[PDB]
């Protein structure tokens, strides 16, 4: 509310203006890249915060309510692009990210998008071509063939 | 606690009370308000109002 | 590894890290896909015999 | 050092206070998962900052 007042110190009639501050919005769009083991998560939004970051939180199996993330789930961190890489990440098995946008302001509410690994061997095999000579091979091969 | 003033020229009093902090921590940071809250109580001969 | 900030820069810590040496776990994503041509060719012209 | 003025320009009695501003704690642990051929290093604080 904004009132004027003279130079004898009477304040005139007020205005008044409205407005908020909020959480910011959740990330809309998830693009989760495969690779070799590792998933790289990098979320979006429909409108762009500068404020705003990302909260990741990983989880091996999903989980039926998605307000237990702050405790069923391991908090991975917070970024703008998060990459998950461990050897606990093996390719076949699908793994969730609760990501949410967390700025000063506030924290907004978590959205959950499934990760994938590579499976695609045959990729990175190619670069494996005709350089394996002799002794990668287990033991077991190695005296079969020597016969 | 109590004090048992007993004065004789006394016509109000005033409390000056408070707290040492206020934060509520959590896991990996962040702090939020806390819900304090006191009461004060007078003699009142035998029953504490 | 050392805590900086705009106030000023911490003492450091020494942290000795080290590689999987997991090989094993990586190899079973490697699982019946080395067809014939990723051995070297020593092996190749070995095992066409 | 904070003091009280009046109407008259007359300073008070000077009251005062004391802080300090020092360089951030160094981390506390050090989780470093391995990898392929990777390292990863990730610190944490006993206190966030």
């Known amino acids: 509310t904004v009132r004027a007042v003279n130079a004898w110190g009477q304040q005139g009639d007020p205005a008044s203006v409205s407005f908020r501050i909020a959480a910011p919005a959740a990330p809309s769009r998830i693009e989760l890249t495969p690779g070799y083991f590792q998933i790289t998560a990098t979320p979006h939004l429909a409108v762009y915060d500068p404020t705003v970051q990302f909260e990741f939180w990983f989880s091996e199996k999903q989980i039926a309510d998605i307000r237990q993330v702050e405790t069923s789930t391991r908090y991975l961190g917070t970024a703008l692009y998060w990459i998950a890489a461990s050897i606990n990440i093996k390719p076949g098995h699908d793994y969730y990210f609760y990501i949410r946008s967390v700025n000063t302001v506030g924290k907004s509410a978590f959205v959950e998008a499934v990760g994938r690994a590579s499976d695609d061997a045959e990729g990175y095999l190619d670069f494996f071509k005709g350089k394996i000579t002799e002794s990668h091979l287990g033991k077991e091969l190695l005296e079969k063939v020597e016969l | ?49």
């Open chain 2, 1 to 49: 606690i109590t004090r048992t003033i007993t004065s004789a020229n006394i016509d109000r009093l005033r409390f000056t009370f408070g707290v040492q902090a206020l934060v509520e921590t959590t896991s990996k940071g962040d702090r939020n308000p806390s819900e304090v809250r006191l009461l004060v109580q007078i003699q009142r001969n035998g029953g504490w109002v």
